[PDB]
Amino acid sequence: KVFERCELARTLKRLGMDGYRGISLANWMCLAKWESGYNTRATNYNAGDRSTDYGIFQINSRYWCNDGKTPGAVNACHLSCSALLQDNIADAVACAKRVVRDPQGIRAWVAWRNRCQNRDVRQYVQGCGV
Numbered sequence: 392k393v394f395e396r397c398e399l400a401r402t403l404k405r406l407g408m409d410g411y412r413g414i415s416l417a418n419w420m421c422l423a424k425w426e427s428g429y430n431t432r433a434t435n436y437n438a439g440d441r442s443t444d445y446g447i448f449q450i451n452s453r454y455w456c457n458d459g460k461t462p463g464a465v466n467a468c469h470l471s472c473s474a475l476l477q478d479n480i481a482d483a484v485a486c487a488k489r490v491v492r493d494p495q496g497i498r499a500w501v502a503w504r505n506r507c508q509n510r511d512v513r514q515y516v517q518g519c520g521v
């Protein structure tokens with residue numbers, strides 16, 4: 392499914408993402424827009440990683456979810472990648488929380504560094520009442 396902008400902001404807030412590890416909701420919204428366009432079905436091949444990125448937060452099958460076809464994968468989220476392709480984002484959020492718990496943190500997403508970091512991110516949550 393493709394989330395409406397404020398629909399996602401409220402869902403992410405309800406699931407505890409606002410301020411999770413210091414990362415504000417606006418920042419999460421920004422990475423989600425740039426990564427998948429708020430689309431839970433988005434999957435993109437990672438060219439230099441022999442893996443695939445899955446879902447709304449574009450999580451990498453080499454380190455976080457097992458898709459059954461990635462060479463030398465780890466599966467730190469202990470999730471099957473298809474779980475990150477469902478309309479219900481509860482598993483995707485738990486996994487994204489898992490990702491930011493590593494040293495690199497939010498820097499694990501190049502889209503956040505190129506489009507959100509050192510940028511105004513207010514626009515993503517403007518008018519959502521979150």
Ligand SMILES: *C[C@@H](O)CO[C@@H]1O[C@H](CO)[C@@H](O[C@@H]2O[C@H](CO)[C@@H](O)[C@H](O)[C@@H]2O)[C@H](O)[C@H]1NC(C)=O
Nearest residue numbers: 437440444448449450451454490493494495499500
């Ligand atoms: C979404 C895809 O295009 C890129 O995904 C990111 O890929 C990098 C590696 O290129 C992942 O970083 C790794 O994270 C490991 C655990 O923290 C670490 O051991 C390894 O050295 C490297 O830093 C990154 O997690 C991944 N991001 C996502 C959201 O999947």
